[PDB]
Amino acid sequence: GSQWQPQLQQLRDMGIQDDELSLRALQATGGDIQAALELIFAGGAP
């Protein structure tokens, strides 16, 4: 299992397919959905 496993699903249902990018974003943010959205949107840390 994963600490952000349920989080990935929440993102997927909203409009995400790649759980990999979702995990990477969640990992970079430390566990934040909205912040992760900006992470992917910017393509990492601007």
């Binding site: 997927r12 409009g15 995400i16 397919q17 790649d18 974003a25 992917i40 949107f41 910017a42 990492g44």
Partner: protein, 76 residues
């Protein structure tokens, strides 16, 4: 018909397209007003992946539908 393209951050843009418009053309229109290349335009309709070769009517996308413009960049 009028559609609503809402990004991940929250930015929502209005787009004027027809039911016979291809998803690919949609991305081309978004790029012209947003400056975002179709390459990063991973348009996902609440989980439903929108294939570029398909049309808006293909996915039963009605008017006032909210499409999610997911910018999939290589980073993170």
């Amino acid at each position: 018909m009028q559609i609503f393209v809402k990004t991940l951050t929250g930015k929502t843009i209005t787009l004027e397209v027809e039911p016979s418009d291809t998803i690919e053309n949609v991305k081309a229109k978004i790029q012209d007003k947003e400056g975002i290349p179709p390459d990063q335009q991973r348009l996902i309709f609440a989980g439903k992946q929108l294939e570029d070769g398909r049309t808006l009517s293909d996915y039963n996308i009605q008017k006032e539908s909210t499409l999610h413009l997911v910018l999939r960049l290589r980073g993170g």
